[PDB]
Amino acid sequence: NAAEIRQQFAMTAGSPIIVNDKLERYAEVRTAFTHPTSFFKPNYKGEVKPWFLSAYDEKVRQIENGENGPKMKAKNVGEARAGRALEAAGWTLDINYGNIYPNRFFMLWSGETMTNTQLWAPVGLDRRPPDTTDPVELTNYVKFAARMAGADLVGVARLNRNWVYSEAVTIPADVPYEQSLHKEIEKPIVFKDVPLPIETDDELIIPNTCENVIVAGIAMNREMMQTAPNSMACATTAFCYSRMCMFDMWLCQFIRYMGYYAIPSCNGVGQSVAFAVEAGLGQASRMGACITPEFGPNVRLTKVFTNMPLVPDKPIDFGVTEFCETCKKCARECPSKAITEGPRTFEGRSIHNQSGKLQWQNDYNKCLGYWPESGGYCGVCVAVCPFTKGNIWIHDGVEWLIDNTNITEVWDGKINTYGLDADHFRDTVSFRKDRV
Amino acid sequence: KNAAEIRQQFAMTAGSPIIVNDKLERYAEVRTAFTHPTSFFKPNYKGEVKPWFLSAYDEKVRQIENGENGPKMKAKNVGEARAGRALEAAGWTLDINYGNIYPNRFFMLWSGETMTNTQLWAPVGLDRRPPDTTDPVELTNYVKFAARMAGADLVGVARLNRNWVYSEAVTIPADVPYEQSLHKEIEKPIVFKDVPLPIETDDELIIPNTCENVIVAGIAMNREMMQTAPNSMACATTAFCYSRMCMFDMWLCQFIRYMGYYAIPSCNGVGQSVAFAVEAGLGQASRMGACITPEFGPNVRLTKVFTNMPLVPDKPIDFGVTEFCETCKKCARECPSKAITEGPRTFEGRSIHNQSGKLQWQNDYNKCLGYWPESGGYCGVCVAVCPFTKGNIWIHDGVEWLIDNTRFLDPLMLGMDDALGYGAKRNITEVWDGKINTYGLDADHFRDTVSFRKDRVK
Ligand code: SF4
Ligand code: SF4
Ligand code: SF4
Ligand code: SF4
Numbered sequence: 001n002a003a004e005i006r007q008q009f010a011m012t013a014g015s016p017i018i019v020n021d022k023l024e025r026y027a028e029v030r031t032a033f034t035h036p037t038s039f040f041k042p043n044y045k046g047e048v049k050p051w052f053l054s055a056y057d058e059k060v061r062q063i064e065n066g067e068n069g070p071k072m073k074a075k076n077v078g079e080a081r082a083g084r085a086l087e088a089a090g091w092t093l094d095i096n097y098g099n100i101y102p103n104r105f106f107m108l109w110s111g112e113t114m115t116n117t118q119l120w121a122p123v124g125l126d127r128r129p130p131d132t133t134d135p136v137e138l139t140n141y142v143k144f145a146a147r148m149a150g151a152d153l154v155g156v157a158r159l160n161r162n163w164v165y166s167e168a169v170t171i172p173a174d175v176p177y178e179q180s181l182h183k184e185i186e187k188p189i190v191f192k193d194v195p196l197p198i199e200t201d202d203e204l205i206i207p208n209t210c211e212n213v214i215v216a217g218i219a220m221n222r223e224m225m226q227t228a229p230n231s232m233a234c235a236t237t238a239f240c241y242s243r244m245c246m247f248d249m250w251l252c253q254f255i256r257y258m259g260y261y262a263i264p265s266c267n268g269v270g271q272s273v274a275f276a277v278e279a280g281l282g283q284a285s286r287m288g289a290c291i292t293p294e295f296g297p298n299v300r301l302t303k304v305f306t307n308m309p310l311v312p313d314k315p316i317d318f319g320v321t322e323f324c325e326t327c328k329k330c331a332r333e334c335p336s337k338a339i340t341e342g343p344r345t346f347e348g349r350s351i352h353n354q355s356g357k358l359q360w361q362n363d364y365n366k367c368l369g370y371w372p373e374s375g376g377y378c379g380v381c382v383a384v385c386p387f388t389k390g391n392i393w394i395h396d397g398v399e400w401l402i403d404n405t406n407i408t409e410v411w412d413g414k415i416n417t418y419g420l421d422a423d424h425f426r427d428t429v430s431f432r433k434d435r436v
Numbered sequence: 437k438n439a440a441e442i443r444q445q446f447a448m449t450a451g452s453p454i455i456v457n458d459k460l461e462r463y464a465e466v467r468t469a470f471t472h473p474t475s476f477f478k479p480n481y482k483g484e485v486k487p488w489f490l491s492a493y494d495e496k497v498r499q500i501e502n503g504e505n506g507p508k509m510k511a512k513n514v515g516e517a518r519a520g521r522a523l524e525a526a527g528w529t530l531d532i533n534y535g536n537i538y539p540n541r542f543f544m545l546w547s548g549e550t551m552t553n554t555q556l557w558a559p560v561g562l563d564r565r566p567p568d569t570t571d572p573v574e575l576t577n578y579v580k581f582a583a584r585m586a587g588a589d590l591v592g593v594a595r596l597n598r599n600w601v602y603s604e605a606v607t608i609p610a611d612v613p614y615e616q617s618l619h620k621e622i623e624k625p626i627v628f629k630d631v632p633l634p635i636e637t638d639d640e641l642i643i644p645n646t647c648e649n650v651i652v653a654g655i656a657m658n659r660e661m662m663q664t665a666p667n668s669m670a671c672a673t674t675a676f677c678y679s680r681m682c683m684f685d686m687w688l689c690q691f692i693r694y695m696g697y698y699a700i701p702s703c704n705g706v707g708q709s710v711a712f713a714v715e716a717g718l719g720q721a722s723r724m725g726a727c728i729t730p731e732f733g734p735n736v737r738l739t740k741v742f743t744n745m746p747l748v749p750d751k752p753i754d755f756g757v758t759e760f761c762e763t764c765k766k767c768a769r770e771c772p773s774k775a776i777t778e779g780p781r782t783f784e785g786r787s788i789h790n791q792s793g794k795l796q797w798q799n800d801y802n803k804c805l806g807y808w809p810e811s812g813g814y815c816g817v818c819v820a821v822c823p824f825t826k827g828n829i830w831i832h833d834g835v836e837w838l839i840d841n842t843r844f845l846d847p848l849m850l851g852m853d854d855a856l857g858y859g860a861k862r863n864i865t866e867v868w869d870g871k872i873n874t875y876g877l878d879a880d881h882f883r884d885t886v887s888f889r890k891d892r893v894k
Pocket of ligand 3: 765
């Protein structure tokens with residue numbers, strides 16, 4: 001069982017991320033998705049375009065010649081398009097691959113204008129002062145709410161401001177969706193003595209009272225992900241981004257209706273993996289993702305920031321670091337050779353990494369480069385990780401221990417609600433005991 | 437227990453199992469208790485006549501200030517009472533005015549053209565590309581797979597029966613913004629014409645004659661929370677599943693469109709969900725009026741998508757519900773408003789809220805809605821006490837599967853269930869402190885809804 005596993009590998013209170021003096025907050029524009037030097041990539045006819053447009057070309061090409069991925073032939077043209085139809089559908093509740101613009105579209109920093117809030121205004125739940133201030137009872141309430149909202153994993157940590165972007169990528173408040181990509185701007189994220197989260201024309205302002213972050217893990221489908229870098233892997237990625245959006249909205253509304261404020265984020269606002277590691281969901285790995293006991297790295301992350309008093313969870317150490325030191329599988333299988341085979345350092349490999357923190361240093365410009373080549377979001381590194389396999393935790397009597405030992409059949413094979421697997425769904429059952 | 441085995445075993449021959457007569461006409465959505473003049477208004481606890489959801493609101497606030505989780509049922513404290521109502525209100529985030537019934541508005545868009553997702557993906561042109569698949573058998577496997585991805589616990593296909601489609605829908609005019617929606621609801625006919633795509637005009641909502649099929653989805657509610665009916669945690673699992681309903685429809689409509697066909701979302705709108713669910717083989721109609729399923733009983737919500745995509749209809753199911761309801765009267769006896777009849781099925785509606793012309797148990801739904809502002813929720817006691825909800829019902833004698841009527845008949849088993857139900861209403865704290873899992877699903881029964889190709893299409 002998983003509950004015993006997490007208590008068994010609990011650490012003493014603190015932050016597991018080692019930093020030095022050179023650490024500064026990271027500007028979101030530096031990511032490979034947004035940075036000028038990485039944002040444009042050639043398509044297969046050599047034309048230089050935004051990476052996802054170049055990726056769209058490869059998708060249309062593959063469909064036309066009956067492929068499910070880079071020279072992976074499909075059963076027929078029918079199958080090939082059905083995979084991309086599912087992929088595209090999955091993104092229904094996500095803006096521009098990630099929902100990163102703060103206080104725009106689904107990611108509103110206040111609930112006041114939402115249709116839900118207006119409907120319930122007579123009850124006045126979002127104006128009534130909180131009836132609970134006890135962090136223990138609130139931690140239980142909000143974690144129960146989080147599971148209702150579709151989190152497979154959830155944890156709580158104090159907000160480490162090092163991981164919050166210095167400046168967010170966003171769009172001007174009067175720019176309609178259709179013009180968004182053309183008019184992306186940078187906007188500073190600052191902390192001040194104010195009662196509520198507020199956006200000026202100059203700044204995104206988070207109250208100094210914003211003590212806590214709630215991190216959620218949203219499980220991807222194992223069988224679909226292991227078809228990486230082909231289209232079914234893109235499809236499970238896509239559906240979970242929409243599940244991410246649902247989670248943030250659901251949870252923010254709960255937190256507001258309890259009498260607090262809440263800031264959603266999805267892929268924006270801050271660095272997810274760092275928050276997740278500090279909140280005890282898992283450990284950082286060679287590939288760069290947060291690896292969890294339940295799903296390995298085959299899980300998506302999202303985060304909510306709030307002033308609601310809560311109990312920080314303890315970080316976890318179940319041997320990921322030492323195992324990644326020996327295992328080189330993701331690095332060896334990476335089609336673009338983006339993942340380092342060397343040790344951890346404090347020095348960023350390029351503009352895309354945040355310097356001043358001990359991590360494995362990877363070339364994310366090389367990773368992005370492969371996506372127009374394969375016409376997707378790859379995910380081979382996730383697919384091949386031993387932790388992603390599902391039947392790897394064994395009990396030797398005393399302790400719990402880690403035993404350190406096709407698209408058509410996916411469409412024709414096992415599936416269940418939201419792509420969850422009933423063979424392992426017991427691992428994420430929760431009682432109050434494991435909530436606080 | 438094998439759910440696939442069971443559904444296989446109780447499969448019928450093709451043909452709508454809802455039996456009707458000559459006086460059956462299509463039904464005006466405004467006739468429901470939620471909307472109609474005669475039932476729409478209810479007195480709050482101070483005598484004041486208000487719209488029912490506003491009277492309910494009043495009872496909610498009263499319960500919070502008094503530390504109550506339900507009517508005359510005390511919470512642990514004021515904080516717990518508020519938390520239950522916060523969870524309820526939050527759950528509704530992706531739903532418009534309790535049901536998303538206005539067709540072609542907000543989330544229920546009949547075309548995908550204006551959606552941010554469709555615009556982002558426009559260069560791939562999946563919505564403009566004609567289908568690469570026309571074979572109904574493969575399309576059935578593809579769409580049920582996506583439906584499961586989209587959050588359905590149950591999915592079935594039926595040919596569309598227009599008898600169950602609302603003659604006129606309750607909606608708002610297009611130029612009206614949400615903030616005024618409640619104060620500007622109109623009626624608007626739904627017609628079937630020879631047109632290529634589903635379109636709305638100033639006067640009509642038009643569904644193409646090519647619209648051949650309806651896909652029906654079952655969305656499972658939480659057992660523990662429903663057992664607290666009529667208190668707040670039962671409201672919460674209801675609320676949350678409505679948002680799940682909404683996102684199912686959007687996900688699935690987009691998939692169908694990107695496959696080269698059109699799709700019409702509905703949630704609680706457009707047509708009668710229970711009728712489609714029965715014809716699509718999700719379950720059987722019951723005394724209380726719900727569709728009862730082998731996996732969840734009536735503790736499940738329904739939504740539906742209408743589409744021209746070629747599909748293999750499912751066989752209807754008969755696993756004995758009718759015969760069981762004919763002798764069991766538990767919901768009728770436990771219903772706080774006496775809305776549910778203890779009588780036999782007729783073709784005659786008891787009031788304007790019923791559709792005359794089809795054989796069913798006739799209940800008085802104005803009575804039902806009447807209890808909602810009293811308890812300050814959406815009740816659901818009928819669903820909570822139905823033995824089909826108890827999930828310990830299936831048994832294999834030796835040759836075949838069957839329902840264990842020990843649960844419907846044995847006084848000891850009934851005496852227990854009444855005791856556990858009595859405690860459940862008063863044990864909200866224990867729900868908060870107790871078992872939960874993703875989307876409120878339960879891992880002990882989650883295998884019941886595993887699916888392979890052989891059980892999606894035949
Ligand atoms: S996503 Fe693909 S290209 Fe990027 S690091 Fe992983 S394996 Fe390499
Ligand atoms: S594949 Fe091996 S080295 Fe890479 S992240 Fe997984 S365990 Fe670590
Ligand atoms: S409680 Fe009894 S009569 Fe009512 S729906 Fe359930 S089985 Fe039928
Ligand atoms: S919801 Fe409550 S009042 Fe309405 S029919 Fe069911 S038991 Fe009776």
